[PDB]
Design a protein around this ligand. Structure first.
Ligand SMILES: CCCCCCCCOCCOCCOCCOCCO
Ligand SMILES: CCCCCCCCOCCOCCOCCOCCO
Ligand SMILES: CCCCCCCCOCCOCCOCCOCCO
Ligand SMILES: CCCCCCCCOCCOCCOCCOCCO
Ligand SMILES: CCCCCCCCOCCOCCOCCOCCO
Lengths: 26, 26, 26, 26, 26
């Protein structure tokens, strides 16, 4: 359903922001 | 409906975060 | 109602990420 | 109310991205 | 609850953007 896609995309956004945090720290 | 818009905008946010990750890395 | 604010704020987030992409690319 | 909390956190995300945009301009 | 997961992930996204703001300042 729609809510499952919303949770999935928010989880990808968390993973991408994690990458950005690590790239900035480096 | 609103949920279709929400999913679409979250997907655009994923794409823009991917672009940022790629710009940071390069 | 909440759903209309949610769509509006996601849309501002899209615009703000576009601005970040633009600044990084410069 | 979960929906109201969602509006609030999206609003903080807008604020934080505006802060980032400002820091990136200087 | 799906809404609870959404609130949780949005909170993580806030914390990650706070981390990014702090890294940009120093
Ligand atoms: C509206 C259909 C879905 C398209 C999403 C784009 C939304 C763009 O918003 C335009 C900016 O509107 C300016 C003023 O907005 C008032 C805030 O609306 C909050 C709800 O009461
Ligand atoms: C390089 C600078 C780019 C500036 C991006 C600004 C995006 C808009 O966010 C401003 C938020 O503060 C105002 C609240 O939103 C106003 C509603 O009108 C938005 C027009 O669509
Ligand atoms: C606008 C900044 C003021 C700071 C207070 C928090 C505002 C965040 O949301 C502002 C938009 O209005 C929120 C509406 O959504 C929840 C309120 O519910 C009202 C009755 O259901
Ligand atoms: C920099 C972010 C906050 C700066 C001023 C905050 C002052 C707190 O009061 C805000 C009151 O505003 C009420 C709701 O904001 C506008 C949304 O309502 C318009 C249509 O619903
Ligand atoms: C989701 C916001 C990600 C912001 C990344 C900021 C880019 C940092 O670069 C600093 C100057 O280069």
């Amino acid at each position: 359903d729609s809510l499952k896609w919303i949770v999935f995309l928010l989880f990808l956004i968390v993973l991408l922001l994690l990458a950005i945090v690590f790239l900035l720290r480096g």
